[PDB]
Amino acid sequence: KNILVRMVSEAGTGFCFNTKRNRLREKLTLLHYDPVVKQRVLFVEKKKI
Amino acid sequence: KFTRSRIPEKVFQASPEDHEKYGGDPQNPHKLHIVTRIKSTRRRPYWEKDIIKMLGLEKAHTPQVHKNIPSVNAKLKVVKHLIRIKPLKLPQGLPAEENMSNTCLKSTGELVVQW
Amino acid sequence: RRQGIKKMEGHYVHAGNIIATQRHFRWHPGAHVGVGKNKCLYALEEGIVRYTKEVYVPHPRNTEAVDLITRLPKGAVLYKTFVHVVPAKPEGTFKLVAML
RNA sequence: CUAUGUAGCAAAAUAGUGGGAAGAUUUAUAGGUAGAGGCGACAAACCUACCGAGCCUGGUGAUAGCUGGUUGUCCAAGAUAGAAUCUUAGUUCAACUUUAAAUUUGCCCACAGAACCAAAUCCCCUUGUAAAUUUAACUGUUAGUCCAAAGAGGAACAGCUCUUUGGACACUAGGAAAAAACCUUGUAGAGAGAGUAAAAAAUGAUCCCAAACAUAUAACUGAACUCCUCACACCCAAUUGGACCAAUCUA
RNA sequence: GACGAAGACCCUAUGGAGCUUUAAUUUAUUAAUGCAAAACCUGCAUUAAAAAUUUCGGUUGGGGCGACCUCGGAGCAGAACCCAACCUCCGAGGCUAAGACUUCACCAGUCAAAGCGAAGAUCCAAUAACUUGACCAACGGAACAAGUUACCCUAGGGCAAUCCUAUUCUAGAGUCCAUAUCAACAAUAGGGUUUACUGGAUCAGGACAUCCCGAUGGUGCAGCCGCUAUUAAAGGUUCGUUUGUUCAACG
Numbered sequence A: 001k002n003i004l005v006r007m008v009s010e011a012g013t014g015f016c017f018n019t020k021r022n023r024l025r026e027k028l029t030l031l032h033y034d035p036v037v038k039q040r041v042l043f044v045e046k047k048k049i
Numbered sequence B: 001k002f003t004r005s006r007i008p009e010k011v012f013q014a015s016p017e018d019h020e021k022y023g024g025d026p027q028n029p030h031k032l033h034i035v036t037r038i039k040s041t042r043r044r045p046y047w048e049k050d051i052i053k054m055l056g057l058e059k060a061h062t063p064q065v066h067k068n069i070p071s072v073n074a075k076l077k078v079v080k081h082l083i084r085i086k087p088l089k090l091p092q093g094l095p096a097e098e099n100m101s102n103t104c105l106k107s108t109g110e111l112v113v114q115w
Numbered sequence C: 001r002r003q004g005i006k007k008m009e010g011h012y013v014h015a016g017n018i019i020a021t022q023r024h025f026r027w028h029p030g031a032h033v034g035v036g037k038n039k040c041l042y043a044l045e046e047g048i049v050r051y052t053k054e055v056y057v058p059h060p061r062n063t064e065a066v067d068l069i070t071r072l073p074k075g076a077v078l079y080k081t082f083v084h085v086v087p088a089k090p091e092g093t094f095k096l097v098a099m100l
Numbered sequence D: 001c002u003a004u005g006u007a008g009c010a011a012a013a014u015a016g017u018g019g020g021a022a023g024a025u026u027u028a029u030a031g032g033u034a035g036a037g038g039c040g041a042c043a044a045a046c047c048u049a050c051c052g053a054g055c056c057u058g059g060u061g062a063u064a065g066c067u068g069g070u071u072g073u074c075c076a077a078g079a080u081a082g083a084a085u086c087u088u089a090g091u092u093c094a095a096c097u098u099u100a101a102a103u104u105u106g107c108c109c110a111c112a113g114a115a116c117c118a119a120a121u122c123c124c125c126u127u128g129u130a131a132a133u134u135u136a137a138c139u140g141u142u143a144g145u146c147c148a149a150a151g152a153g154g155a156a157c158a159g160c161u162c163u164u165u166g167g168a169c170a171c172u173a174g175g176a177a178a179a180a181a182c183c184u185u186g187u188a189g190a191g192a193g194a195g196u197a198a199a200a201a202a203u204g205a206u207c208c209c210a211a212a213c214a215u216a217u218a219a220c221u222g223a224a225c226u227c228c229u230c231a232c233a234c235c236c237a238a239u240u241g242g243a244c245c246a247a248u249c250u251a
Numbered sequence E: 001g002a003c004g005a006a007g008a009c010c011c012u013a014u015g016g017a018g019c020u021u022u023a024a025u026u027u028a029u030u031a032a033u034g035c036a037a038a039a040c041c042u043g044c045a046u047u048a049a050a051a052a053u054u055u056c057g058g059u060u061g062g063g064g065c066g067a068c069c070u071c072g073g074a075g076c077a078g079a080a081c082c083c084a085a086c087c088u089c090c091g092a093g094g095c096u097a098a099g100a101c102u103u104c105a106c107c108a109g110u111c112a113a114a115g116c117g118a119a120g121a122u123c124c125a126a127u128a129a130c131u132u133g134a135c136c137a138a139c140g141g142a143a144c145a146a147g148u149u150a151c152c153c154u155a156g157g158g159c160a161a162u163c164c165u166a167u168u169c170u171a172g173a174g175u176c177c178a179u180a181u182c183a184a185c186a187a188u189a190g191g192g193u194u195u196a197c198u199g200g201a202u203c204a205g206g207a208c209a210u211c212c213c214g215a216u217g218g219u220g221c222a223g224c225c226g227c228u229a230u231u232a233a234a235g236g237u238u239c240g241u242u243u244g245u246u247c248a249a250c251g
């Protein structure tokens, strides 16, 4: 029902963390915190886990 | 289970019938208790072995003196069935720095000088 | 599990020390006693712990309590227990630093 | 098949009664098959008296959470929470125990205090006490029995499994007949001294089971408890500390 | 009679040796092929047989069958903490930092003022990485191992809920009537019920709750005998067919 996916950022790359998403939902994007620059950036999924 | 016993205070209330039965008096009570052990600590719970070890009553009869203040009575109300308490009587007053080495305690509980 | 008092009345509790671990709200927080997410009570300010009985006036934001108090007769009140820490030391002192 | 014999005459025999006895018979002589192998009219039968796997030497002082043992004198502290484990016949950690060392509080404990849904318990000022915590260093015990009590299981029984509070035992001594578990009692030696503690019954199957006693004043008897004269380290298991030392060799 | 001086049966061991396999791991050896090597051998791979090494988790009706095995919530555990269950009823698989709590060890686990910034273990492999997963659910986890030993060997351990029977109220009956008989339930007494989810011969000692013989009461026996009741343990208490949880039937 739910899948853990490694979400990665765009600006200040290299971040990786397994967040949750309902499998019935499409590809996910969020606005959250990048600590390399400590700013709000759009994070997007890359590959399901 | 088996537990410590909290004696109701109602028992420790001398009556007008008890007062003339023992040589005592409500007013002007007595300074010191002379206490002796007449029963074994063995076969009794540890919270009585320790009390007896604390009041100096380790040996058998071997009388020993204690204050008549509630801090000690609370201890004697736990071991009241393994001891005899009598009131020390001083019909000649406390001895002086002379007559300390010539005192004597009679079986009636009176401390006296020079036998 | 050990969900009971861990600092009893008249005990010297420093900052952050847990006063009581509980399941339900047996002991509500009082003066200088903070609550955690698990309802643990901990001592915010160094001092001496006391327990008291006070009147209960729940948050209106809460619902399971704001309505029960609405079901009580005239002259009624919900009393409940609280655990406070009377602070011991003062906040600070002033000392000579420079004589210019 | 029976009897004798059972360290016997014999580590399988003797006496009788029996099956075969010109055959797939029986037998002397030399040779062959060799051990996870041989041989087997398969019975796990036999391979030098003991073969579901010979015997000897070596690896080998195999390994053994199992059984059995473990050697001079004397003294002292010293016992039944628990957790995990191809684990409950054992180990490791903890708890308890011991020694040495540092420091200052430890135990008992009234008043106050601990929730909405009976016993008691927890916590501390004082008080009686002198112990407790900490550090350094090791071993040993560990899932015990009975009795009083409150519960759960089997009736509220089966002398029943289990949890909890306490006591005793595995330590001395006296009593209830004998008696680990009930009652009395602890710190230890000598005495041809003394005082006590507990402690006596009322009104089915070998052979009953102390003997007796209705009425002379309630006191006495009774310990390693206590006192007395003298002397003192001189009555626990596992474990731990200490003081001595027999005999031999050497300087 | 001195539990008088070999052989069995039950349980245990992370003992041993096996047997079978559709239990795990292997193809080293052989046989087929297939591919390279100069008509045969050498090397590699796949498939099979033949073997080879290896293991048999835990709590339990009565051992087996069958369940469960980690974590969480309610009574036992009435009032700080803790306390068992194959006892009782159900589900789950932002960074930094004073102080503390804890599932009685450890390993894990839990709360958190201020301050700065935004609003189910270890090992292994793939990995630049930021770190990552399944199994480990026998849930403190051997990386991968089952069924079974009637041929087995060694070390070792070994005051009855439901009921049977007699006495109490007679109350129900008995052609009239409780007592001439059963005497229902119950109560008071003495005695057992283990499986499912050891006789015979020989010699017998003893009790009486007496089968006979002996003594006595009543009778509805008008009488021997019958019936019940009291007393009585000196004596006696058969031979056979069929069969051997041991009785039962039959002459």
Ligand SMILES: [Mg+2]
Pocket (backbone or CB within 6 Å): none
């Ligand atoms: Mg050995």
Ligand SMILES: [Mg+2]
Pocket (backbone or CB within 6 Å): D065, D089, D090
């Ligand atoms: Mg073992």
Ligand SMILES: [Mg+2]
Pocket (backbone or CB within 6 Å): none
């Ligand atoms: Mg000693």
Ligand SMILES: [Mg+2]
Pocket (backbone or CB within 6 Å): D124
């Ligand atoms: Mg206090």
Ligand SMILES: [Mg+2]
Pocket (backbone or CB within 6 Å): none
């Ligand atoms: Mg003595």
Ligand SMILES: [Mg+2]
Pocket (backbone or CB within 6 Å): E014
């Ligand atoms: Mg084992």
Ligand SMILES: [Mg+2]
Pocket (backbone or CB within 6 Å): none
């Ligand atoms: Mg084995």
Ligand SMILES: [Mg+2]
Pocket (backbone or CB within 6 Å): none
């Ligand atoms: Mg529970």
Ligand SMILES: [Mg+2]
Pocket (backbone or CB within 6 Å): none
């Ligand atoms: Mg537990």
Ligand SMILES: [Mg+2]
Pocket (backbone or CB within 6 Å): E102
């Ligand atoms: Mg812990």
Ligand SMILES: [Mg+2]
Pocket (backbone or CB within 6 Å): none
């Ligand atoms: Mg903050």
Ligand SMILES: [Mg+2]
Pocket (backbone or CB within 6 Å): E138
């Ligand atoms: Mg396991």
Ligand SMILES: [Mg+2]
Pocket (backbone or CB within 6 Å): none
């Ligand atoms: Mg486990």
